[PDB]
Design a protein around this ligand. Structure first.
Ligand SMILES: [Cl-]
Ligand SMILES: [Cl-]
Ligand SMILES: [Cl-]
Lengths: 31, 31, 31
Protein backbone atom coordinates (compact mmCIF):
# COMPACT_ATOMS: atom_id res chain seq x y z
CA UNK A 1 0.00 0.00 0.00
CA UNK A 2 2.73 2.41 1.02
CA UNK A 3 5.00 1.28 -1.80
CA UNK A 4 2.04 1.47 -4.19
CA UNK A 5 1.47 5.06 -3.06
CA UNK A 6 5.22 5.59 -3.69
CA UNK A 7 4.93 4.16 -7.20
CA UNK A 8 1.86 6.34 -7.95
CA UNK A 9 3.86 9.35 -6.82
CA UNK A 10 6.85 8.40 -9.03
CA UNK A 11 4.36 8.45 -11.95
CA UNK A 12 2.92 11.79 -10.82
CA UNK A 13 6.41 13.27 -10.77
CA UNK A 14 7.27 11.96 -14.24
CA UNK A 15 3.98 13.41 -15.53
CA UNK A 16 4.75 16.81 -13.95
CA UNK A 17 8.09 17.01 -15.70
CA UNK A 18 6.61 15.80 -18.99
CA UNK A 19 3.91 18.53 -18.78
CA UNK A 20 6.54 21.22 -18.36
CA UNK A 21 8.66 19.91 -21.27
CA UNK A 22 5.57 19.71 -23.49
CA UNK A 23 4.73 23.31 -22.57
CA UNK A 24 8.21 24.37 -23.69
CA UNK A 25 7.75 22.59 -27.02
CA UNK A 26 4.26 24.09 -27.42
CA UNK A 27 5.73 27.57 -27.04
CA UNK A 28 8.55 26.86 -29.51
CA UNK A 29 6.13 25.59 -32.19
CA UNK A 30 3.72 28.53 -31.56
CA UNK A 31 3.66 31.68 -33.60
CA UNK B 1 -7.81 1.74 -1.83
CA UNK B 2 -10.60 3.85 -3.27
CA UNK B 3 -8.59 7.05 -2.92
CA UNK B 4 -5.58 5.24 -4.41
CA UNK B 5 -7.73 4.26 -7.38
CA UNK B 6 -8.75 7.96 -7.54
CA UNK B 7 -5.12 9.06 -7.54
CA UNK B 8 -4.24 6.52 -10.27
CA UNK B 9 -7.10 7.91 -12.33
CA UNK B 10 -5.93 11.52 -11.82
CA UNK B 11 -2.59 10.37 -13.30
CA UNK B 12 -4.33 8.59 -16.18
CA UNK B 13 -6.22 11.78 -17.00
CA UNK B 14 -3.07 13.93 -16.93
CA UNK B 15 -1.37 11.39 -19.22
CA UNK B 16 -4.32 11.46 -21.65
CA UNK B 17 -4.11 15.22 -21.98
CA UNK B 18 -0.32 15.15 -22.28
CA UNK B 19 -0.60 12.56 -25.12
CA UNK B 20 -2.96 14.82 -27.05
CA UNK B 21 -0.74 17.90 -26.59
CA UNK B 22 2.32 15.92 -27.66
CA UNK B 23 0.44 14.77 -30.77
CA UNK B 24 -0.29 18.42 -31.63
CA UNK B 25 3.40 19.29 -31.27
CA UNK B 26 4.40 16.23 -33.32
CA UNK B 27 2.18 17.42 -36.16
CA UNK B 28 3.53 20.98 -35.99
CA UNK B 29 7.18 19.80 -36.16
CA UNK B 30 6.36 17.32 -38.99
CA UNK B 31 6.86 18.05 -42.64
CA UNK C 1 -4.14 -4.75 -5.27
CA UNK C 2 -2.74 -6.77 -8.14
CA UNK C 3 -5.02 -5.06 -10.66
CA UNK C 4 -4.14 -1.70 -9.09
CA UNK C 5 -0.46 -2.53 -9.59
CA UNK C 6 -1.41 -3.43 -13.20
CA UNK C 7 -3.15 -0.09 -13.67
CA UNK C 8 -0.15 1.81 -12.20
CA UNK C 9 2.08 -0.04 -14.65
CA UNK C 10 -0.20 0.83 -17.61
CA UNK C 11 0.30 4.48 -16.59
CA UNK C 12 4.06 4.00 -16.26
CA UNK C 13 4.18 2.57 -19.77
CA UNK C 14 2.15 5.43 -21.26
CA UNK C 15 4.47 7.91 -19.50
CA UNK C 16 7.57 6.14 -20.89
CA UNK C 17 6.28 6.44 -24.44
CA UNK C 18 5.21 10.05 -23.91
CA UNK C 19 8.73 10.90 -22.61
CA UNK C 20 10.33 9.47 -25.74
CA UNK C 21 7.92 11.32 -28.08
CA UNK C 22 8.52 14.57 -26.19
CA UNK C 23 12.27 14.05 -26.54
CA UNK C 24 11.83 13.70 -30.32
CA UNK C 25 9.86 16.95 -30.44
CA UNK C 26 12.44 18.68 -28.22
CA UNK C 27 15.17 17.74 -30.67
CA UNK C 28 13.13 18.90 -33.68
CA UNK C 29 12.43 22.33 -32.12
CA UNK C 30 16.10 22.69 -30.99
CA UNK C 31 18.72 24.57 -32.91
CL1 LIG D 1 -0.31 5.89 -11.45
CL1 LIG E 1 5.95 17.65 -26.99
CL1 LIG F 1 2.92 11.94 -19.46
Amino acid sequence: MKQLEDKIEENTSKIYHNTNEIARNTKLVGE
